[PDB]
Amino acid sequence: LSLLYHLTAVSSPAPGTPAFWVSGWLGPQQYLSYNSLRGEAEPCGAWVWENQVSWYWEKETTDLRIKEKLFLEAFKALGGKGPYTLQGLLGCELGPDNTSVPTAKFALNGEEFMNFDLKQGTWGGDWPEALAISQRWQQQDKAANKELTFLLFSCPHRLREHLERGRGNLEWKEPPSMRLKARPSSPGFSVLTCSAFSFYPPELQLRFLRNGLAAGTGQGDFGPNSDGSFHASSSLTVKSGDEHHYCCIVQHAGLAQPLRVEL
Missing domain, CATH: 3.30.500.10 (MHC class I-like antigen recognition-like)
Structure with missing residues (x-):
């Protein structure tokens, strides 16, 4: 740097x-x-x-x-x-x-x-x-x-x-606070927003997961906070009901290893 x-x-x-x-x-x-x-x-x-x-x-x-x-x-x-x-x-x-x-x-x-x-x-x-x-x-x-x-x-x-x-x-490395929530989408679909709060450094990768098998970063946006921390999200669209058979994964310096997130 x-x-x-x-x-x-x-x-x-x-x-x-x-x-x-x-x-x-x-x-x-x-x-x-x-x-x-x-x-x-x-x-x-x-x-x-x-x-x-x-x-x-x-x-x-x-x-x-x-x-x-x-x-x-x-x-x-x-x-x-x-x-x-x-x-x-x-x-x-x-x-x-x-x-x-x-x-x-x-x-x-x-x-x-x-x-x-x-x-x-x-x-x-x-x-x-x-x-x-x-x-x-x-x-x-x-x-x-x-x-x-x-x-x-x-x-x-x-x-x-x-x-x-x-x-x-x-x-200094500050880890993120996660919340994976899901709003319902167009008639027969649900969006998967993985909310990421208060992290440093910026270098954060997100990765979606289909009940075990892979999935890939959704529509992924980003920003900073006031204090100098950062915020992130990414979303994907899934089958309603089928969503609970899906997990979030966050990779960042603040944690020891890629972490799962549940619904």
Whole structure:
């Protein structure tokens, strides 16, 4: 798992909306928000209770405010008819031989149009626009260098800290609470909803079972909770009465072994 930033900036936000705002994810886990109205780096969740490095958050607050302006200066590179949406995906993960894997990505109106060629420290995309911003972004002094610094050097550090300081919060595995219920369906049929509640990590497989013999994942949907846990369901359609001759099976880190569920 890696260290990643969701940043998104809009030309025409709603009255009371951050024209630009960011998120911090330790893989599938959030730990930071940040906006422009308030504009202070305020961490979220169990990373509120992380043995922090005092000044460190302020150091993010600086790192983030720089990008902040870049993303706002960007709409000046764009003389289009508007309104506009510019998305950013940044981060890096520590690999095998101690190094990291940088991920600098950009979408304009939700359409990927820029990576950051580390091989020469430059922004890239053959559209007119991703050659208006990459060009003005070069025109900004030391911005392409507060980059190689930020992806190669500042990143893996923040990662090789939190991994030591807070490893547990990740290493932590919370098992799901199940309930397999069944509502009746179209005249002569019954749906099989396997409800899954409050689990971490997300990596959950479900699997249906016909009175012993196999069956397969039904119509399977998914989401998160508030605390940072996850919820899931999957359903299949069976013969009414015949349903009681069916079981649910859940596979997740929180349990020792694939567990059955009954009706």
